[PDB]
Amino acid sequence: WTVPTLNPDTPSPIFGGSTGGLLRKAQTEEFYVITWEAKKEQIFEMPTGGAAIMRQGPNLLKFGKKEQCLALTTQLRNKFKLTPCFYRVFPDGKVQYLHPADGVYPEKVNAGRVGANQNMRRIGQNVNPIKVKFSGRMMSPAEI
Amino acid sequence: IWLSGMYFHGARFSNYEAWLSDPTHIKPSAQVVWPIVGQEILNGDVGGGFQGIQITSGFFQLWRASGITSELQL
Amino acid sequence: MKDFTTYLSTAPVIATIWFTFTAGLLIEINRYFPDPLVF
Amino acid sequence: SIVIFHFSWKMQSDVWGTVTASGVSHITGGNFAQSANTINGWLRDFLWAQSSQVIQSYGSALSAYGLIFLGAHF
Amino acid sequence: DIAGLTPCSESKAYAKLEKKELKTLEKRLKQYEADSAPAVALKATMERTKARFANYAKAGLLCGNDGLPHLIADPGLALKYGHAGEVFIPTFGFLYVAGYIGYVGRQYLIAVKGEAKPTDKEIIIDVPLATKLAWQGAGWPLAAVQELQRGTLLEKEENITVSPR
Amino acid sequence: GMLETPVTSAPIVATYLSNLPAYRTGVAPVLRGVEIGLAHGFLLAGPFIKLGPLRNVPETAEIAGSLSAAGLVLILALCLSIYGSAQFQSTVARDPLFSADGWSEFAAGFLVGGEAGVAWAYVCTQ
Amino acid sequence: AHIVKIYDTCIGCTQCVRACPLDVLEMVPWDGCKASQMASAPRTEDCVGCKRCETACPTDFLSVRVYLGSESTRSMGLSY
Amino acid sequence: EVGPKRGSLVKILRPESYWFNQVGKVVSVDQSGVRYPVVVRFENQNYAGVTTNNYALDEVVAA
Amino acid sequence: ATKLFPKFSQGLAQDPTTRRIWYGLAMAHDFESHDGMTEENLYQKIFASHFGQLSIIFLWTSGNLFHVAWQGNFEQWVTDPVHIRPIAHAIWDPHFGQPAVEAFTRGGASGPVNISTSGVYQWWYTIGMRTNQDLYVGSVFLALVSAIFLFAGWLHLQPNFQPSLSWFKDAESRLNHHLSGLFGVSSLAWTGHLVHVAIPESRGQHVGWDNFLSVLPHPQGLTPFFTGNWAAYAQSPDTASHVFGTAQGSGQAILTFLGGFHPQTQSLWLTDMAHHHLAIAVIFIVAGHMYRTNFGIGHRMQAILEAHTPPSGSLGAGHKGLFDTVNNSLHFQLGLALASVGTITSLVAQHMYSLPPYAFQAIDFTTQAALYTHHQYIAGFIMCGAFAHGAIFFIRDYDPEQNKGNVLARMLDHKEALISHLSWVSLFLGFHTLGLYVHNDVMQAFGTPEKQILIEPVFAQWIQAAHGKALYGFDFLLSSKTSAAFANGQSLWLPGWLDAINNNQNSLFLTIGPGDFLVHHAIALGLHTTTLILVKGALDARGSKLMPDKKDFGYSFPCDGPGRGGTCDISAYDAFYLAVFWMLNTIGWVTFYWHWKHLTLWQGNVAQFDESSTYLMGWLRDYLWLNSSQLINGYNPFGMNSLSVWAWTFLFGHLIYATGFMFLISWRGYWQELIETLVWAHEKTPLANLVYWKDKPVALSIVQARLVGLAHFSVGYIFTYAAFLIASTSGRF
Amino acid sequence: PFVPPSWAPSVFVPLTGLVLPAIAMATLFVYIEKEAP
């Protein structure tokens, strides 16, 4: 498996437009682009409000935050049994692949994933805040 | 059941017949309380030789508009 | 009849009957013994 | 609540009242046009002035209303 | 007597209040007939008022400057001046009925806790068991004292859940 | 994507907005400020003159209204200056108005234009 | 950014990962349970703090915890 | 054979557990070297509506 | 990009929303949560903050003195302090019309002024102030003191002047110096002022800085003090015909213990107050030599704490390790200090209304009411803060390893029993007090006032009889003429005290009845419920069954999410939050009782309160509806008077309270969605999208919403009651 | 003497009410929005 590359010249689903789309953040900070493959033309619900028609083949959409892209991914996976993927696009043109990060969905275990933020103890074994006091900043006992 | 109760109260525990002969002085009343724990004070002097609670639902005016003149009809 | 008695044994019906009995007892006591302030 | 308050004050001030010889006397004396333009007028002439009947209703047939008036505040 | 109060049988404000109540009742009665329902009801209310005032004065209650009865809650003063019927005897009466209710409820919970579905018995009351426990609860103080003396009234600290401190 | 309607897509309203001084994109910011300030001070002098506390007394209603409008123009100029100082701190063609020097010159032009508009509205009622 | 931590009481039921609405958690191989999997949080910069993962955790006490930390555009879920 | 007998009643010793100092029935005990092999089922559900949990060998006592 | 504000939090400086400004303003004094904060730096910042606070206090006092000396009528009020109203300061407002100008022009001034209700006129008159020059000099002196304190605060932050961490932990030295110097020496100096200035000025003799070295406070001149004949200072006191401020009827004594009140000023004797300060000065100075600092003698508080464990083990380890958990925790010390200060503030309110210390203070009804209400509300807020800091101590500074088996750990060991019993007491008090009230209301409504339950407060009346009141007829202790306690004080202080307590025209142990009993139970209910909420929040601060790891989330956090059934308002901060409402309700009940009893007392009809305080309808009609008639008539369509400012403040408080209900009922989500729609509207609007925000607009956080709603609730509550109390008391008298 | 002039309120009240708060609000607003280097 290899990381996919965003194709900016990808057809978008048939939508008449809405007022819940992108804002100035997309032009000044970042935005997100979701792409998927549809077996047939089908009407789905847009996470920003309204009903759009996904075309047969590739489909590309833009959203203001990652939650909208994942909500659309969940809707396409649970209802139409599709496999969507999204990226984070910056105004300079940089594209960053986001989900599924390793090509496999995170709900199923995949080899090569290194565990992060894992504490080899339980909650009851956490120390008291007094032992964490006078640190660099506000730190919780779970951070150590 | 609620409407039947309103008609029954107007036919057995009211002063509608007395109010018909003097609707400008007698206060409409269709609820009487039992003489217990000193609550009988709520049975005010509404007029027409009757003691009770002055009702504001307007059933007396509605019954007068329908032509009801006796408690038997209610 | 067994199901009906079981329905009557439910918490709201039992509470209604018990409170009606208790209220009736207190009301009858205050009716036959009006204005009781001290023993 | 503001709607029913306006209705009560307007009816008691410019509509409802008794009829005398060459003149009509209202319940509140026509004080709506002069006092409903301020919040203080609504609090004093409508809420404080008209609540006298419900707070001194004890010992009469309307005492129950006063009791509910307190219970509703609870 | 106690706290500078005077007995209601000698208080002038007490008799004045009785006269005021009878006066307003008589004033309301003056507008009706002599053999009608409101007249009979008002006369019954007047007789009840007279009986209530005479019974309160006969009970030995103490009246203040307002002419209203005042209760004595101190057991020493109540037992020394004959005021135990105000706050002492009703105190023990409430304690008996309240402990009665609490003991019957506790017995019902302990009885249904050893069954298959105690929650089912909690929503659908077992009337025969509840009636039997309600009748057997008359000896609640003796039974409670016996349970406390045997150590079966309380639960051990090791069998009660607590927070992680 | 977005919603297009005849209100936001009519060529007449687009030309009207492009003709406004704020959307000129190519003139000096001080001139834009002078024009906007004059257009604002002229209309601002009205409410204080006809509704202020001294609106019934003669020969001083216009004086008090114009002074109040001048004070409001001064407050708005201070607001424009602090907005420019807190908005442009670092980093078609780029409009020079959206810059520290451009916005400062715009605020100064707005102050001069607003005071001139207030003074012109005062003498226009005499 | 918020702090998301996984504890050793995790049974690898993958319910927290399926309930995450911004793809913050994932499953990694492990040997401390029957499922041979463990939850992980390698993308905490995208966590908003909805605590849906804590709602989906069946262990007593929870195996995943979210401590609200610094707030940014991503953590506040702002689309503007 | 390690751990309590299946079907027996045990007391939970985990302080942060909802069923601390409570009695639960033993369902199964894992024979591997897992941290929490004992499976305990309880009659009363916790705040999350769960009635079962996993505990270590030293976190449960035969009571 | 990263903003400069706030400089103490790097995480907040990186926040691109409007939440950064709000959180930077609300976390400025939480030095423990600042970036790179150490213990030594923490103590140094607190030291500087203390100096700044003293500077602000002294500047405020100098401001009050300056305004009374400039725009007041102190020179005219001293001549006739019975019929002249004190002036706070002048009023300069261009919004005032002509009728408002002549309406506020009163008190003998030449323009609109404010009538002071703080009582500084009576206090300054009693301590010796007579002219405006004295107030001017005092104002300049306090301004100089304020500047000196501010400079001290700035100086103790610079190098070579920052105290070390070890200096801040010298508890024995600090306690010795505070007891002997800050308390004893200050009281001794105050005794010197009363003996040298206040007492001679009350006798018509001017004693100022120009002649205090040539004027003797006593005609015997320090000889009886050195020879031990101290009784010579109590000879020839002020008679019953003494006129305050003149030499008619004045005496020569400087240290007496006559007791009671002055027959004219209806206040405590100046000689008695001087003697009081001298005795407490000696006691505090002696107490200041208890701890060991540098001379071998004295105590070590650690030894006394460690040697105080019961032998049977009832208290476990006792107080072992309590010295370290208190000295190393600033929240523990702050909680103890706030608890003691709140109790002392309540004590001040009670003693000040019952035993007026300043001349002509009892006649000023508005001053008495305002002072009592002010101190009681301040005390309630301070008490809530004491418990809040106790919860903060449990979360941030409590160490179970160091406090193992001592009383502190045992409190958390049985916290369920404490919370359950507090709940039972509150439930019993609420059920019975409300039941008796509703019963009396039903009896009064049905026309049978003799059927209401009126329990006589025999215990409090018994105590009043023990103090000397013979109205109830118990005749024991001070009430009996043949008791040892009565005969042992007949030559020192019992005559004046008995004459004052048996007088029904003052506030010294007022006559009580069933209404007082019922309202006292309401007060008990309020105290127990507020204590239950605060204690439960402090004990459950480290965790509970719902949140076993609550201590890992800090003292204040929004919630733990909707999981596990829902965890709204689970933090200790939320417990304090809910307790503030109960504190306001409790102080409202105590101030309502105080104001109604004193209003009926001053009006000459105590029977009105005695007969209407037994039912809630009497409280709503005879106290709230009846006393607000003049208040709401401050401005009407026919004109206005000087009382219109209180009417405006009344409506102002109602508006603030109602505005608080908005932040209290509606929550974040709705507002965040609405703000998002507003963001879209601003971004799509021409001629307005050219102006953009620097911080992204977001709705207020859950914790911030609670704080804002509570602040509005409290502000509206305070302003509404203050306006009503001042307007009713001033208009009636 | 320390007595202020008769015109002192007519100058200090407008100052403390409009000039000083405007300057303080402007300086504080510029300080809050200043970006760190």
From Swiss-Prot, chain A:
The keyword Transcription does not apply. GO terms for cellular component: chloroplast thylakoid membrane; photosystem I reaction center. It is a peripheral membrane protein. Its main location: plastid. One of its GO terms (biological process) is photosynthesis. Keywords: Chloroplast, Membrane, Photosynthesis, Photosystem I, Plastid, Thylakoid, Transit peptide. It comes from the Eukaryota. It is found in: Plastid, Chloroplast thylakoid membrane. PsaD can form complexes with ferredoxin and ferredoxin-oxidoreductase in photosystem I (PS I) reaction center. PSAD may encode the ferredoxin-docking protein. Belongs to the PsaD family. This is Photosystem I reaction center subunit II, chloroplastic.
UniProtKB/Swiss-Prot annotation, chain C:
It is found in: Plastid, Chloroplast thylakoid membrane. It is a single-pass membrane protein. Its main location: plastid. One of its GO terms (cellular component) is photosystem I. The keyword Transmembrane applies. Coiled coil: none annotated. Keywords: Chloroplast, Membrane, Photosynthesis, Photosystem I, Plastid, Thylakoid, Transmembrane, Transmembrane helix. It holds the Pfam family PSI_PsaJ. The keyword Thylakoid applies. GO terms for biological process: photosynthesis. The chain crosses the membrane at residues 7-27. InterPro entries: PSI_PsaJ, PSI_PsaJ_sf. May help in the organization of the PsaE and PsaF subunits. Belongs to the PsaJ family. This is Photosystem I reaction center subunit IX. It comes from Chlamydomonas reinhardtii (Chlamydomonas smithii). The gene is psaJ.
UniProtKB/Swiss-Prot annotation, chain D:
It is found in: Plastid, Chloroplast thylakoid membrane. Chlorophyll a' binds at H73. Belongs to the PsaA/PsaB family. The PsaA/B heterodimer binds the P700 chlorophyll special pair and subsequent electron acceptors. PSI consists of a core antenna complex that captures photons, and an electron transfer chain that converts photonic excitation into a charge separation. The eukaryotic PSI reaction center is composed of at least 11 subunits. PsaA and PsaB bind P700, the primary electron donor of photosystem I (PSI), as well as the electron acceptors A0, A1 and FX. PSI is a plastocyanin/cytochrome c6-ferredoxin oxidoreductase, converting photonic excitation into a charge separation, which transfers an electron from the donor P700 chlorophyll pair to the spectroscopically characterized acceptors A0, A1, FX, FA and FB in turn. Oxidized P700 is reduced on the lumenal side of the thylakoid membrane by plastocyanin or cytochrome c6. This is Photosystem I P700 chlorophyll a apoprotein A1. It comes from Chlamydomonas reinhardtii. The gene is psaA.
Swiss-Prot record, chain E:
Probably participates in efficiency of electron transfer from plastocyanin to P700 (or cytochrome c553 in algae and cyanobacteria). This plastocyanin-docking protein contributes to the specific association of plastocyanin to PSI. Belongs to the PsaF family. One of its GO terms (biological process) is photosynthesis. Keywords: Chloroplast, Photosynthesis, Photosystem I, Plastid, Thylakoid, Transit peptide. The keyword Protein transport does not apply. The chain holds residues 63 to 227 of 227 of the full protein. This is Photosystem I reaction center subunit III, chloroplastic. One of its GO terms (cellular component) is chloroplast thylakoid lumen. It is found in: Plastid, Chloroplast thylakoid lumen.
